[PDB]
């Protein structure tokens, strides 16, 4: 019934920040530190969307992206990352990332996008089930 929303950020501080900003929105969001917290996340709780930084301790963001693609999870990925080119942009977007954020994002920036790609997800799953 209830959307979830997972968060991958290294940078555990400014995950709260962005629990802060979606405090009061329609959706449960949960926070992992590492990339190999992130597929066991997507793995088990399968959550509606993520919000992927590109950065991360263990292995890069895109090696996310990547493994949703291979696994065949509906999840739609937003990235939000510093030192983003329009090249890596492009390849992200074309990989099957449904936005690319970049860093400082806004309250309102980051509150629509996610409630934006959470609708067309959730409008193309309630055609296919009963």
């Given at each position: 019934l ?29 926070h ?12 088990r ?12 301790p ?8 990547d493994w ?8 739609s ?5 510093a030192?983003?080119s329009?090249?890596l ?10 936005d ?31």
């Amino acid at each position: 019934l209830r959307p979830r929303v997972l968060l991958v950020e290294d940078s555990t501080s400014l995950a709260i920040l962005y629990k802060q900003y979606v405090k009061d929105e329609p959706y449960d969001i949960f926070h992992v530190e590492t990339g190999r917290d992130a597929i066991q996340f997507i793995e088990r709780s399968k959550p509606q969307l993520i919000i992927l930084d590109l950065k991360l301790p263990d292995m890069s963001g895109e090696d996310v992206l990547d493994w949703i693609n291979q696994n065949d999870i509906p999840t739609s990925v937003i990235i939000a990352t510093a030192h983003g080119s329009v090249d890596l942009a492009v390849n992200l977007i074309q990989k099957g990332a449904e936005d690319f954020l970049e860093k400082p994002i806004n309250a309102d920036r980051l509150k629509t996008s996610v409630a934006l790609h959470l609708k067309r997800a959730k409008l193309e799953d309630l055609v296919e089930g009963h």
